[PDB]
Amino acid sequence: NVSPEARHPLVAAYPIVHVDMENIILSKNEDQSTQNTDSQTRTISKNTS
Amino acid sequence: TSRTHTSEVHGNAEVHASFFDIGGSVSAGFSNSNSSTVAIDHSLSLAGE
């Protein structure tokens, strides 16, 4: 894989690796919640006067 | 506990038209009442939800 121009004893062979970023995916860490509640109350009273 | 003073002022009027013995009476009024009223209550309730 050493390229044909660098198969001369005076031309150096060396890799140049650089990393380039194509996207950035940020994701918000946040926690919802919901609730639903029913009720039934029966009051039975008495009163003297 | 309640002790009530009910003062009264008043004006009154009557008449009786006849042949010769015609009678009339206009008047007024003044009154008070010293009413001490107590009330004892005992009650209940049974609520379940």
From Swiss-Prot, chain B:
Bilayer topology annotation: Multi-pass membrane protein
Compartment(s) where it occurs, according to its Swiss-Prot or TrEMBL record: Host cell membrane; Host endosome membrane
Domain of life: Bacteria
Marked site (Cleavage) residue numbers: 20-21
The protein's role, per its UniProt record: Mature form that oligomerizes and forms a pore to translocate the enzymatic toxin components edema factor (EF) and lethal factor (LF) into the host cytosol. Following attachment to host cell receptors and cleavage by FURIN, homooligomerizes to form ring-shaped oligomers that are in a pre-pore conformation, and associates with EF and LF. Toxin-leaded complexes are then endocytosed in a clathrin-dependent process, followed by a conformational change of oligomerized PA-63 from the pre-pore to pore state, which is triggered by the low pH in the endosome.
Free-text domain note: To pass through this hydrophobic restriction, substrate proteins LF and EF need to be unfolded prior to translocation.
Name of the protein in its database record: Protective antigen PA-63
Taxonomic lineage: Bacteria, Bacillati, Bacillota, Bacilli, Bacillales
Gene name of the encoded protein: pagA
Part of the full-length chain shown: 324 to 372 of 764
